[PDB]
Design a binder for this molecule. Structure first.
Ligand SMILES: CC(C)c1nc(-c2ccc(NC(=O)Nc3cccc(C(F)(F)F)c3)c3ccccc23)c2c(N)nccn12
Length: 258
């Protein structure tokens, strides 16, 4: 396969953390290319199983999806992608950058993510695990969708009946909008998993975050409609967020946190 590279073309320089399946390093590819490198422990997945899973990353190509560069598909398995210099969106929001982010930046990040998901939508794929921990951030506030597949992010028909669709991703996107506007707080604060699913079935929805405009919370509520077919498309969500400060909140004024 043409995605295969030799093991000696990689250098793992800085350990970054724990990715969804293995550990992740910042490194160099072919001595010239800055890359992110993920290592899978030999016990985790067969080479046959891995090639089926990696097929998605080989299929999909979009500026807002983290881009696969190369693989070493024999154990021990290595996965090589573009390097996202700011790490996960969740860490980004919680960390030192959080306090400088205001609504225009956060809405712009949301628009990029929706753009990535609109591509996933047009390709008839489903993410199944959309949330800030699975979004990566680069230079210039670039955001990209990563780690294709957490009850608090999961639509009730998906959690209850296994109905994972692009519409359940739309629900998750609405929850991701609250992470953005709270600078990364856990959704449903003070509620454990068990309360959440029951509360949501009886119609409970998170309220408007402090300093978040009502019109953006209305968009969240559209994402959290009980009937999945009544939720907006990502194409709609992308356009709404890109146009937000002209068409929807032309009179926005900066606040203390948003
Ligand atoms: C530790 C954090 C903050 C982080 N994770 C990734 C990161 C996300 C998603 C991937 N994609 C991935 O693991 N894809 C797949 C596809 C099919 C099968 C498998 C697996 F199951 F074999 F692992 C993984 C990565 C891959 C390879 C290397 C990295 C990453 C990155 C990054 N790219 N740049 C900066 C920081 N990063």
């Amino acid at each position: 396969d043409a995605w295969e590279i030799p093991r000696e073309s990689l250098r793992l320089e800085v350990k970054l953390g724990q990715g969804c399946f293995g550990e992740v390093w910042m490194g160099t590819w072919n001595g010239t290319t800055r890359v992110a490198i993920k290592t899978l422990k030999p016990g985790t997945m067969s080479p046959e199983a891995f090639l089926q899973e990696a097929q998605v990353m080989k299929k999909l190509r979009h500026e807002k999806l983290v881009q696969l560069y190369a693989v070493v598909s024999e154990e021990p398995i290595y996965i090589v992608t573009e390097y996202m210099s700011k790490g996960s969106l969740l860490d980004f929001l919680k960390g030192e950058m959080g306090k400088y982010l205001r609504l225009p930046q956060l809405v712009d990040m949301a628009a990029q993510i929706a753009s990535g998901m609109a591509y996933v939508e047009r390709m008839n794929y489903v993410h199944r695990d959309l949330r800030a921990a699975n979004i990566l951030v680069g230079e210039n506030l670039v955001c990209k969708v990563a780690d294709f597949g957490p009850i608090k992010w999961t639509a009730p028909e998906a959690a209850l009946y296994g109905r994972f669709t692009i519409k359940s991703d739309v629900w998750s996107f609405g929850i991701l909008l609250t992470e953005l506007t709270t600078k990364g707080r856990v959704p449903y604060p003070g509620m454990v998993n068990r309360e959440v699913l029951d509360q949501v079935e009886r119609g409970y929805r998170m309220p408007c975050p402090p300093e978040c405009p009502e019109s953006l919370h209305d968009l969240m509520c559209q994402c959290w409609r009980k009937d999945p077919e009544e939720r907006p498309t990502f194409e709609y969500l992308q356009a709404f967020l890109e146009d937000y400060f002209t068409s929807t909140e032309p009179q926005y004024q900066p606040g203390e946190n948003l």
